[model samples]
Target: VGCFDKKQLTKLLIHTLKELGYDSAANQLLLNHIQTFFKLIKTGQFHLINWQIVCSLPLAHSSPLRSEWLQRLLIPLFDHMLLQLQYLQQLMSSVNSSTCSDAEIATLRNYVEIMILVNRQIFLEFFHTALPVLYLRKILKNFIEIWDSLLVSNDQFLNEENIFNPETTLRELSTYLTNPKLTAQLNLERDHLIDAISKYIDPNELVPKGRLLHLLKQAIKYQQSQDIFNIIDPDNFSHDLTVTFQEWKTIQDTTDEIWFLTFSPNGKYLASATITVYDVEQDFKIYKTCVSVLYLMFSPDSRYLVACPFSEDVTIYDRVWCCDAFHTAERAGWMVVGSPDREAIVHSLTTKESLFSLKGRWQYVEDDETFPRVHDVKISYDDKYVLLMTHQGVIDVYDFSGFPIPRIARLDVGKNMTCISLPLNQHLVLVSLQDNELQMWDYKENILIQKYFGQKQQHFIIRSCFAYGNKLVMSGSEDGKIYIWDRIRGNLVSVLSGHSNCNVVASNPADKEMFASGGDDGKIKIWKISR
Candidate 1:
């Protein structure tokens, strides 16, 4: 006799179907509102005023299931509350209870009621928790937005506290609109968030929100480099190391300052165009290029000096220039660069006399139809091909280790290919364009590969280098800065300061960590990796 009558169930069902906006489903069914609310819960349409619907919706089967369901439904919003509460407390205007207008008083009444509801429900029903914390900052911001929408900002009605100034807010929750650095970074990694997060945990992060020292330190990390240096105590803090350009040992030449420095495959030798080849470990000059020379290459084994001087032929010096370690008469009119291979070039000196007399398939076309005004000559390290560039916009590729050096291909890439960067294998060659730009080409495929620019360029030759396994491309800028770029993605990574016209940049083929840059200021800075 205590059971709910079928009429009662019927009435309740009709009401639920109306509230849930599902009339047709109800007309064909006698479903209870309990199941209906569970369905409505999924769509988040069951609100507070639908008491009959909500009260009937929760677990009718078991208390535990109902509690679990309630928590699942309520916790997400509670946390959402956690994001907004602080800002509400701080931004809500305070008005004298008696002087308030009806609307103002009513809004204030609503404010207090919502606050009490959130707190009471959170503590007793859901788990709840702050920040110098700026912690749960999202919660604080949301409440302010909603509260401001509901309550009038009429200055005559309620006065705001100055401490609640937007400028004074401690911190902000990061979001898609406000903070997208993480998004860009994740895309760069293809969403390898875990790897960098491990690195950050990629680099660094949220220290205690309000500790003066930590905040300042955090500022330095995410803000600017000057932050920690400006905020930290200079007098008392300890430093693990002190490094200054003044302290770094410098290498200078008086007769002819070293304009370029290149490390050998093992990082033991530093070869300069000034021809002062230095043994870094011994701090001594290994050998000089001997003649006035600009084009240079240290053979892969460091056994020979493959170079060319003006008005002389390209020659390979097999050892210490004993003056007669055998000379090559195969002279070219301009600068010559050699391959990395120890035995890349075939012998062209009979009686040490070179050029036309010594032939192994490399010959300029006799037609003179194309000018042979060779600006730069490069031989592949693998000794597979010889690349010759002419000032008149012709780049010729020849099969190496051949008799009559068969001309394999010709690249008409620019009016003048100002510079060519063939890092390790001569697979992809980065060529400087006439229009202050750069393009990389797949030599094997003979196709245009990539392009880069953003520093500055002109007729003069400027040097650049690649690091991190060709992931990073660096070139000196005319603007006294070093421009670095991501090679594969083709994006500018950074622009480093300090220099005059910095045309010289080189990465150690052996150790990418250490790189060198020479400037118009006549200074060469050796940079090394640090923590």
Candidate 2:
């Protein structure tokens, strides 16, 4: 045998095994010979033979022997096939058992189903072209029968208890399956379990409506705090006086006290409203004349100044105090100027004329009702409307067309409105009252939007309000403090304390970062906001 040609001997053994109907033995013998031939071929001691020539011998055999030999050859590989069979039987038994949870049953069912699919593919591939229609039908019929038996057993087990109890089903199912794909498929089942648990909890034990509303309110308040601007102390700020120039005191004749002091729209001039006289002076002059300036305003063109005094009079001065211009009172009698003697007047910067006046009248018992007293006034940026707040908390809106119509919107309080400022956007107005209340109003809608209540200790009547864009609002109070707020959100941004009694506040029209404030303390301070 050792001397015989190895390739020829391997061929002979293969043929003999096929003829004897010892198919398994033939396969084993062929595999051994192939391995030996490969070893010799690697060492260059033998050459390769045509595998097709060796394989053709089985096709020449009679049908019964060919089938028998093929079955024998395939049997050893089929031995490993019992592994899946044992798994399927174990899964079916677990599904049938009443002691198993729904989760465990679900897991077993999934495993068995997947195994059936995988094994069907394997069996088809193994039989290949040799698989007859009869054999295929028999295998499929057997698989269906096994599956049907498992399903019947599962139904019997489920029927013993309430299979509709989703919680029990889910608890059983969760134990066996962890794949995300499978979990997603089971989501409906999980949701059903959750619903069951929810139903189990009594509604009467839930939180009361009032308590829930209170908690919701608290949450809303917390959310509001998160959005509020951070409060900064103005005293902690160190002043850099590089911007300060010469400061001086001007002597006044009447001792009745000058209240609102404002610089001309052009910083080159200054104007002050005294109970007796409206004083106008040059910026460079030390001792300027107390001109008959009243409801004083610099023309928008900065070419003229309009001053309306207490006698229902109107006066216009050139920007230089160089000459006097036209007066509206001389041209039109009963001009739309507010109450003949008491209404507040706003003059146009561009026109050098009284744009509008808000006047209230008090009538005797025999006459009609009294017009509310205009306590504070603000004009919109576009000169479209004016807000006149009264001592009785009544807010009136008037169109700038001169013919007056009552557009009354009342405040929630009883205090007099002390000061008012219009935001540059003209959408909102800030009104400060004697009651230390700051109210924001939507000017377009004529509605009170929000209220900010500051320190109530000293009766900090807001004396003046100055706003620039939406970034900052500086309000001077009678208590000698200026309250700064974020204009949009109405949050108390900071409090500035410097003047003894701050009366008038003005943010720089050109440079928003700088502002000037004047007070009865006989001093004017320029403040610069830092980034």
Candidate 3:
């Protein structure tokens, strides 16, 4: 009732036994046909030749005797067994010379006796019945004589133990085995036997543990990342997203220079800050204003749009106002800026002068620009500390609870950092380094969490951001692809193509499926799950 054919079924059983490391059973299965084929060959019937015609013809060949072939085959096997017995006798002598207890000696004696009896039974049952190899029988007799003498001399009780030697017999055995031609012939025949049968053999395939489950999980995971809806069920795999994306709407108002794009916290408004804000509902412009805007942010309640322009004052647009900048970090309305000349200045926005000054050089270099300058800064969400990143691959932390912000811990990541973002709720912060690697570091404990790669960035500043509620890490490449990674697994999940010299990507704070990318192409692509 099985589905497999006979030959195929036999193959399965043979290989299964092999995989299970059951060599004896595997050979037993193979020898079923091999022995019959061997019998045919020995009887001269396998070639299907007319023997009467061959006998009448002048051409003939002399064949070796079957006994000669048997001796040639079995002598090496017998010699190996003889070597085993020799080894056991050596062990026996060593034990006899030692001061080991009677129980140990008795146990060893029992094992050696069992081995001798087993070899004797092997000779009587198989070798003697078939061919009667007198050489093996002579060695067997010598073992029996020496072992019997040892037992009888002990008189059923322990004495100062001594070995009963079979020196003459052992020397003769050693002399007979000393011929190099014997072992060479044995090895040559072994190779020949394997060569004759090798073409008929199948190799065993080794399989890894959990291979099936791991591959299946990866298969689902690949599709999940490609799916725009991002459906995930921990136990059961589910997918509901479109496999292909077509542009739904393209918002363009400014000509040829869109530096960054972000969706409002409400997700109803989109801003491509050259800078212009758009209504996502109608793809219509709500506001249009510009002056070297480099970064943009929407207020949490979606009432204010904050613009940070390059080398100019920061602007907020409800009425339009200007402010100052950072090498600086602020928490609970108190701000601290690192001075260009190796000093930290704590300034109260309400007070007149500086509250305190902590002065210390971080690194030494010939040029002022080569010295460690604060590349980025952030005060913790808890307002407990200020974290600063220097271009010389160092992150410094300061206790911000008091006026004199004391330096707490400094970690060296060993690569020049470009930008950093500390997820508001988590202790770990994502850092974009100059070496094109995005690394996450725990600022408070100074432990590295994970790193991601695959974006081509070396010269220009490419900032990385967190997406999908900080479960994903994304960065735009100089090669026009946005690389996204699963933060927890520390692996690249997907690469979004369709922008030229792309350098900035923003994930919607309100919508997980929705995100936008702005590049040097001056175009912003709006991507979401297809309905």
Candidate 4:
């Protein structure tokens, strides 16, 4: 009974100081004098500091004298917080000992409990008092994101740091040693700190420049920081950032393995040998042909669909029936960039015919080797030239001038050029080789400019494409991750993860920040990185 009266008496003194508007004094008396504050209440000496009855309040709790009183309280507040954290470390040491009795442990924990509660209240006030925008919830939400991943890590990311060793600590005084009610209450207060971020904070903008963005970013990093992934630069941190296509909203309705993917000039339509995905409801359309459609594209106007059928026809269809280059001639559709056999020539699409036919016969680097054949073909971005390549390193360049397109030159590569694409003005050719590497080929200069390595492509065919308005290049690795690079610098930008054995990747020409990828899992995933 007397104990209850004295406890109430101490809170009464603390309340009196707050009412009199000396929160700095009231705060110091509460946190720094945790054990002794209550004792003097029984001694009958602790008073209102020439004060009286009122609620314990914030520094700004009183409207008058607040400017001076608030200023004073805010000054020593940091030192007092430092005072509380050090005491907590002491209490932690007491609990980790074998000598402490159950009742003694509870006594120390009870003290640690109120101390943290006091600071938790103060830390929020300190932040809101000095800082603006991006409040507690955003920092905490992003902060917990760092921990939530580690919280259920199931031991995968665990190592020899401050991993909260339950082995020894639990044996001495576990969480039950503390007042469970207070601990749980304090935790709920913190859980409220975690909710939703409207969006990621742009590092580039702060207030006059938002300087504290770096502070919050560091705090988010320091939270789980055992893994370097947490604090990585936003531009470099993308491995798990995008959602999998398996989640739905798919334009490609088929479960069949996708071999290739490309976007139209206007970015309104997308096509692959298997199907086409457009930008509307019921956005998918399958291409059904008796012969395998090895390559495909939507013509520059998006009004025509061009498909190169295996060894048979090159057809252009617009809505209904259109043109088929070899249907009337009964000839196999010759291939491009690289093929098994070739007499590479250009064609006139209007008549589905050509005065310049596959007439140039070429020998392989080795006469004993199999006959050089076209493995793939390409038309430059301007539609002015056609490139034919063979498996035996034979390449033919044809000038697409009016009627009789002539073979302008012949070149050789170390191996088959597996894939290639031309950027906007048809200046450089980006090529993939069987030797597990990528290249920037200066077509006009007829020289290999730069080679890129990292992605694996020893056997299977994987694809790469320009993104972010041709400013970025991206590709997939056999390691089941997507790699991106700065197109001009050719420096790796970031890697994204979601698919398994990712085989094809493409960026939306309409929206540089949005892109899609297909994998060996027979699934497509869409990815977005805000600029």
Candidate 5:
């Protein structure tokens, strides 16, 4: 608006629009400009230069030869463009040679050779123009004004000795500025220069390589962390919720306290062990077993439910059968169960017979008759190993791929370690310790990767789950708040408050947006993100 010609203004506007991400409008504006250029050539006015009176600029007042300089520059560019157009006309006749006759083969060669040179010739013409410098001059004026406000008014304090020496002037100026008015005025002026520079120049060329890719990775990880279920595929991961779940229905079928909740791997059934299995879709009780079902899981085929009840035999409900391991872990044909009496056994599902037993070596304390109990057992997600967790904070990993099932790694997660969950692909495990901390363990390396502590866990077996392909770790607390953390950063994401002493939180493996939490209150709430 200040002294810009139409071409300069249009080019700047296009750049500004692209920078601000109004790409569609910028493309439309560019297409219009191209159409105008095509019409100008068609009308035989491509060679004509529209000159305007240019005495308004500061440079025009100083230099009378500006018009002559532009005239010389424009004439050469116009000549080159005219030659290019003539070459195109020659090529148009050469094109008919395929069907009719040749306008000389060198017409095509000359046209292409000129096409290559025209780009550099046009660039040079643009480089020689004072249009960019004219805008820079306006920036220089602002800079000059800033210096005048800072130095000119302080002239009495800045003598010739300090004026010539920046070191002395900087120190003296620093010491002299006790006035709030001067400081505020200088700061505002400095900010104006900063804003102008930022608006005019894009730092994209100076940005680090893969900057956009890094930002995308961060966003994907954040979205995955927020995804409650680990079902999302990394290749086609969504920024929006893949599936939204709500408080669709609640079941109060059990009269006694519900110890645990789980979904069948096929997701057709929901089971809460007081112990009962219900049809997930119809909400009807499909099966019920003896009371005090400590822990239960659906078999790989999803046709059978394996349950472990207190002091009773580990049971498989094909309709009904029992064995003695308080908690159970199952693979395709193998089952491993751990007991409160400090025993863990591997059994064959086909024969329903015990294959071998795993023993934990404990350095018992004096009068410590109440030794460690194998509170939980899990087979690795990859089915390569089996983990047995005990109340005394002892975890033993066993190679599950073959016979003998040798002990591989042992982790001491600290006393009162209540539960552990392995994410889909990770060799790592998240352990909930009743000592007010949830810890991430690299079981293969026997290293403690990180610890998350925010929600309370003192004397209860509060379990945790990994969601969104293990990007996030979540657990319920003794104080009734659900704690969610970004596993990689080891930072707290949010705390969900509802239940009274929330004991269990489970991620719905089938639905990324849905999860369930329940506890001492005897009420289980089905939760989902509000999309």
Candidate 6:
């Protein structure tokens, strides 16, 4: 039989068992009774024994194991006990009982307070355990409320000393938790954070140096190839093949400023464009005329030389003139070509008469009613289509009939479109915008196939584009840099730089690897690509 009455018997037994050092057995009995007590509380019974008396059971404090076991067992019961306490508090309030005359009601309220104290003591006793760690982190948040309640009740014992201090201890434990083996599982995440911080601090240092070094080496090789060749005096040449011409001797007289000079597609003739100049005879004598000539098609087909003056006029001359009447743009003046019909006039190389003229019809305009102005022009490989570009970002395509059918494609890009070229095929055209973005377009599909953003720090303006072959495309920029790209893969194959402010690039009709570039420096250089 237990020493005390049933009410106090459970408590006295636990005390005696703990004092006698039977801590394990005492905790086992406590565990069993605690479960039974919880069941009773859950079922809304609080008459037999009060929670205050049960929670205040004075087990011997000498044994740490007993204290730890008690805390662990009670920690799991906290939520349930809170629920029971709240129910009892609600019942007392519903009765409007202000006095402590009701034994059960007073006992329930007292037990609720006692259980709260007991829970805090247990939490402090096993603060190193996972259960206590979680509980302390959660319950400590209520410290201000707990302090407020203690102050209102005039409780002298409630102070900072009663609270658990796990800061230093938890810090030490955290070190062990973050050991190398455990951290390896999160290596990628850790690396990402490290990289982000490192880049934020110094972005330039984060650039891949090895890759940059390789690119620098390639640039050096290109620079070596671009070295200027020593200009040899024309009289120093042993061969008499060099030809020179005066400003005006035997060609059609026109007084239009020329801005562009280009060899014809067949190489048998050259085409030149002049600015607007109207006076036929007087203007031709005063102003330097813009002229383009067609040389011997194949060195043997020199029957006639075709000339297009910068004015809206075309003139053809036979080889008997003995002087090439074609005026290079550098020797003439700045000029802008008009649409083939408006200001651009085409002539038969053998007839020298204006056969037909080219013109553009405005197809679409933005809501602002602004129309694009013609900027550049090119003929397709089969002469089936003529491509015209405008400053308002429109590319117009026209069939080669006498009265051409026009198909217009707008760049949709809001910026000004500067230059246009046909790359061997009618389906694809190369265009350069004011933003310095060089793009290859599939006009049939109305899609941008590839883009090359030229070098930034340089004055890199794409002046012209031409097809090197069926698979390769070439572009000449104002920075004097020539870029060759593989049309299929869109890979930049090579860069050629020699001229200054190059304005036009043309690949040889006979050989795909041979190309020519005309520049602002008044020189045209031929490039022969080997690989």
Worst 10 residues of 3 by lDDT: 51-60
TM-score of each: 0.44, 0.41, 0.48, 0.45, 0.51, 0.36
Each candidate's lDDT (Cα)? 0.49, 0.47, 0.57, 0.49, 0.55, 0.44
lDDT score, candidate 3: 0.57
Give the RMSD in angstroms, all C-alphas superposed, for model 6.
28.0
Kindly indicate the candidate among 1 and 3 with the higher TM-score: 3
Across 1-531, the per-residue lDDT of candidate 3 in tens digits comes to 387477755766676677666799888988533334334334523223122211221111222222422232232246555565454455445445556433443433443353453343344333112234454555576576656645554435434444433444444434434343543343332233323332222222212223445567788877666543454543554665444434455555445866666677577877775666777666545655543766665554476666756665445675111211222243334455543345555553443575565554254334222343564566665667777766568888877554333467788899667767667235888888877788888877779887887888887877678776767778888888888887777777688788748867776666766677777776777766455
Model 5 / residue 102 / CA error / Å = 74
Off by over 4 Å in 1: 1-249, 255-259, 282-291, 312-368, 401-405
Per-residue CA lDDT of candidate 2, range 1-531, in tens? 688777755666565566656788877885643334324333432113222212222111121122322233232223233433433444344434466433433333333343344334333333223343343344434454555554544544456554343334333433323333543443342233223322332233321223444555666555545433223222132332322222233343344434565554444455556522223333334434434433555554444555656543456555111111222432322222333224554433344555444343233233235555554455555455656665566666765455434553444445655556666434777776665667777756667787776733245343546554456666766677777776667777778777545677765454444566666676555565443
Can you give the lDDT of residue 39 in candidate 1? 48
Off by over 4 Å in 4: 1-252, 280-291, 319-340, 348-352, 361-372, 404-411
lDDT tens readout by residue for model 1, 1-531:
268576754655565565566778777775444335334434433133232333232221222212322333332254344543432344334232235344443434343333433332222221112231242344445544544444444443345663233323223222422454543443332122222212221011212122444545664455433221122321233334432222143454543433455666666777666555666666545555444555556655556655545445455655111011121223221123233221123333232533321123245664324334455555565556666666667677766453333577777776566557666523878776656677777666678888887867766667776765666677876677887777767877677776647767776677645677766666666665442
Best candidate according to TM-score:
5
RMSD of each: 23.7, 27.5, 21.7, 23.9, 22.6, 28.0
Ranked by lDDT, the better of candidates 1 and 2 is: 1
Task: At residue 510, give the lDDT of candidate 5.
Answer: 68
Tens-place lDDT per residue, model 6, 1-531, is: 556366455665565566666778888987544435434444534344443335442222211122322343243255643443443444333444344333433233333344444344334334223665455454532432333333333333345653332343334434434353543443332233233322222222232223434565666545433321212212122232322211221223343322444444444333333322122223223332333331111111333433433342435434111112212322221112243233344432334444343433236544423343454555554455556666556676655544223454544555666556556524887777666667788766578777876632133334556654565666666566776665666666677766546565665454444555555565545555333
Top candidate by lDDT = 3
In candidate 3, how many Å is residue 4 off?
A: 28
- Candidate 5, residues 4-123, lDDT tens digits: the string is 577755765666676667778998997633234324334533234221111111121122223432343233244434453443343334343443122222222222322222222222
